[model samples]
Target: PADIRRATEADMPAVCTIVNHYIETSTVNFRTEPQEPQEWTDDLVRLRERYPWLVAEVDGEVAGIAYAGPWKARNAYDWTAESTVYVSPRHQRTGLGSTLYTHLLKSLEAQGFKSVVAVIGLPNDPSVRMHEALGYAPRGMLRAAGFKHGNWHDVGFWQLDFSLPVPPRPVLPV
Candidate 1:
């Protein structure tokens, strides 16, 4: 929680490390390999166009990262975004995720997004606890909705009405 800043091109490698760790060791995400630079660029270009891509810095190092992006392709969901956060393995339990999430949600609220959602792989107690710690509640599970790493996995969905609905937007944070 030393500092938080908008991610720059240089931080991608450290960001890559955090995400690639999850890609390798956990079913937290459905993907198999570390995302290539091309994919990261594409996603960042798209998300930065509409949402936020933020990182936390501690003592001149990137400690963790957070971002929000489209939950679905449908235009009707523009006012909503799904949240994704990943912390350095060494930085976990040091309040990095919590600090990143707090800034992220506040930034989103300032932007007028009505909701923030998250997707957790089943049995992911850390993720489940993270959301609950942030005022989110489970929105139930999608059964066997994904096939990856040689087996089907259930997704635990959660949501929070960050603000009142009605295509909420603000010139400044409420």
Candidate 2:
């Protein structure tokens, strides 16, 4: 069984390992170099108060993570968040991605977010299908937006919008 819960700093190393696998082997993550666990720690500490960072554990081992962050720095973008999710290779196709992502989106909505966005690397059929099935609609695409792994990759953006009152209240803390 998989246990999904809030992520702590102690989970950063495992999270780093899972993400680095994709960074090194696939275009799923555009980073050209591996990320240090400390980077994940810093991000977790900085964003957890306002954003939700969750980890899924299977038999006491961290298997996946899903999180959200500011979509843009501008004030008008405060109501929107950008989301990302990564699952261990061994956990792929096990429905963990969808499970984790669904929880993350629900958390965002609870925090008063009006919209959520996910950016997918081109030709990632599984990711596209999962996001769409979760209620994200294709918003647009940026061709050749990232150059990595010795090639340029197109980026697709999908957005999920929530209904909110006019002059909605400020976002709540996570």
Candidate 3:
């Protein structure tokens, strides 16, 4: 059985292992180089200061992760976020990614986010389907937006909007 929860500093090793694998083996992530342990820890530090970052545990081991970060640098974009989810090969097709992603979005909504974005690399059917199923709508695409593995890959953004008639000031997850 697997469940999702807030990520802690202790999850860095497993988180780095999970994410760096995609960096090395797949175009799923645009990063061409594997990430060092501290990089992920630093990311978590910065992200969790204002965003929701989570890990999925299966029998006490991390099998996947999901997180949300500000989509832009400007304060005007504070209510908008970019989201990501990754599942270890050992956990793929076992529903862990979907579960974690769902939780991540819900957490964002709770934190006063009005919209969430998913930027996906092309040809990833599963991720596209998962986002669509979760009520994210296709917004637009960027042609050859990223360079990785000796090729330029297109990226698409899928968005989920929340109904916040009078949006409140943003709050970081506790």
Candidate 4:
């Protein structure tokens, strides 16, 4: 079983491990170099105040992570967010990613976010399917948006919009 909860500073290293694996071996992430634990720690410190950062724990080990951050820096984008999810290699195909992502979306909605977007690399069937299953509608694709692993990859965007009241209230803190 996996326990999904908010991530703390202590969990950054484990989160780094899960993310760096994809950075090193897959096009799912566009970064060409592995990120240091401190980078994730900084992000958590800076963004967790308004965003949801969660980790999946299995037997006391971090197995996956899901988080949402500002989709754009402008003030008008406050009601929108960009989401990300990554599961450790050993935990893939076990539904942990889906569980983590589902929780992330729910958290964002609770925070008064109007929309959540996921950016996926081209040829990633599993990610596309998961996002669609969660009600994310395809928006558009950016052709050759990234060059990673010596190849060009298209980036696809999927967005899930939340129903809001008339003149929606301001977004709430997490």
Candidate 5:
């Protein structure tokens, strides 16, 4: 809570490093190549345009970042968001992600979002635990949806509904 803030352009490089580091050497992503500057720029632009990109810091150093973006492109999916949190290796398991994700969810809720989804990599125990603790429930498994390190990996779908008494103003009809 103390270190959480909205991510800025200056945080992009470190955020990219943390995310693509997982992508390059871990089954977290199916792709082998790390994201480039243009992709990061586009991602940041998209997040800022329609979502909240929040980061966590410790004593002025980055700990992690999280954001909520459209889970699907279709009009029926307007109230649903996909969330991501990337923690620096040094900060893993120190409660940084849990914090970042809580803030991300709150930001999305405050913005009138309804459903939040987390697409998690297989065997990522901590992530699963954090999501569960933060009220996410596993909806399904995407069997062999990701291939990396010469083998196919499973993806888990975790979701949370805001459970508001009534729906928010629809940007697009569900």
Candidate 6:
């Protein structure tokens, strides 16, 4: 069994390793270059301050990661977040991605988020199916949205809306 929990600074190295693998091997991500560990460190620090960043461990190793962050920098969009989930190749299709994302979104809703969005690279049937299965509706697709690995890829956006109604203003998760 795997355990899913909040990420700590110590876990960023493993998270970076997982992300770096996809960057080098696939067109699923727009970033084609490898990132320094500091990138994860800085981003996680900031994101975890307001949102959620979780890691899944199986047999004491990080097998997946999930997180949500500001969809837009504008204050008006504070109640919305862009969600991301990645399961290590070693653990893909084992349900860790879905489990991590399920808990992340539930936590976001608890933080008063009204919307969660997932942006996936096109032609990715697995991700599309998983997103749809998780209740995210297809919003639209952006043709030639990103160019990477000498290929231009289309992107799809899926959105999940929550009913929080008549906001007295949302409180940040502390």
Ranking by lDDT: 2, 4, 6, 3, 1, 5
> What lDDT is obtained when candidate 3 is compared to the true structure?
0.87
Residue 80 displacement in candidate 1 (angstroms): 0.9
TM-score-better candidate, 2 vs 6: 2
Error of 5 at 59 (Å): 2.3
What TM-score goes with each of the models? 0.89, 0.97, 0.93, 0.96, 0.90, 0.95
lDDT of 5 at 10: 79
Models ranked on TM-score: 2, 4, 6, 3, 5, 1
Most accurate candidate by TM-score? 2
**Quality of model 6 by C-alpha lDDT:** 0.88
List ranges where model 2 is wrong by over 4 Å. none
lDDT of 4 by residue, 2-100 (tens): 999999999999999889888898898788888999999999999997999999999999999999999998988889999999988888889898899
Q: After superposing candidate 4 on the true structure, give the runs of residues whose Cα lies further than 4 Å from its correct spot.
A: none
Q: Count the clashes in each prediction.
A: 0, 0, 0, 0, 0, 0
| lDDT for 104 (candidate 3) | 85
lDDT of 1 by residue, 65-86 (tens): 9988878887677667899999
Residue 139's lDDT in candidate 2: 97
Which candidate achieves the best lDDT against the true structure?
Answer: 2
lDDT tens string, model 3, 87-154? 99888889888888888888888888899999888868998998898999999999999988788999
Estimate the TM-score for candidate 4: 0.96
Candidate lDDT scores, in order, read 0.81, 0.92, 0.87, 0.91, 0.81, 0.88
Give the runs in model 6 whose Cα sits over 4 Å from its true position. none
Candidate 5 residue lDDT tens string, 1-174: 449888877778878888888888777656688887567667877667578788897878767889878888898788889988888998878888888888788777877788899988787887888889999999999888877787888999999988654555863311
Q: Point out where model 3 deviates above 4 Å.
A: none
Clashing pairs in 2: none
Candidate 6 residue-wise lDDT at 72: 90
